[PDB]
């Protein structure tokens, strides 16, 4: 995602008015392209056993490319949402008892 910034200042418009743009306000400068930043992991819950982790209902911070391409379509892993954790929390609770 390309994130840019204007060279020139834009005069304040006011409360309830739109700013007045000029030909000089089209000049931008690249601030950051998010496609060149460190990747982040994807928190998921495993519905079935996997080579990386064979425990069901286990949390795994796998790469985004692994979960989206293979795990999520196949259904092996579900999104680690507040509601899904509860469903798998019960199963873990039963084993403790």
Partner 1 sequence: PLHKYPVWLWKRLQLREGICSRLPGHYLRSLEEERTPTPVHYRPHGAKFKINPKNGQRERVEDVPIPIYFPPESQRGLWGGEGWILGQIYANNDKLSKRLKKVWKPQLFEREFYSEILDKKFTVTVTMRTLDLIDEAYGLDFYILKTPKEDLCSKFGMDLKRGMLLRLARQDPQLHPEDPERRAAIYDKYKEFAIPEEEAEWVGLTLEEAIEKQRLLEEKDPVPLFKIYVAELIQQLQQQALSE
Number of residues lying near RNA (CB under 7 A): 23
Measured from the CB atom, the residue of 38 and 82 that comes closer to RNA is 38
The rounded distance, in Å, linking the Cα atoms of 27 and 15 is 25
DSSP structural state of residue 35: G
Going by C-alpha positions, the residue among 3, 1, 88 that lies closest to residue 43 is: 88
CA gyration radius for the chain? 23
Q: How far is the CB of 76 from partner 1 (least distance, A)?
A: 14
Binding piece for RNA, criterion CB under 7 A, among 20-28, 48-56, 79-87, 88-96: 20-28
Q: Beta 77-79 vs 59-63: how paired, if at all? A: unpaired
DSSP structural state of residue 13: -
Measured from the CB atom, the residue of 23 and 95 that comes closer to RNA is 23
Which positions touch RNA (CB under 7 A)? 2, 8-9, 11, 13, 17-18, 20, 22-24, 26-27, 30, 33, 35-36, 39, 64-65, 68-70
């Amino acid at each position: 995602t390309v994130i840019v910034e204007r060279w020139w200042k834009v005069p304040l418009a006011g409360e309830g008015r739109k700013p007045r743009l000029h030909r000089r306000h089209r000049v931008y400068k690249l601030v950051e392209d998010t496609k060149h930043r460190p990747k982040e992991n994807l928190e998921l819950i495993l519905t079935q056993s996997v080579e990386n982790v064979g425990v069901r209902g286990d949390l795994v911070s796998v790469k985004k490319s692994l979960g989206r391409n293979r795990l999520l379509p196949q259904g092996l892993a579900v999104y680690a949402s507040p509601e899904n954790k509860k469903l798998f929390e019960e199963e873990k609770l039963l084993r403790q008892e």
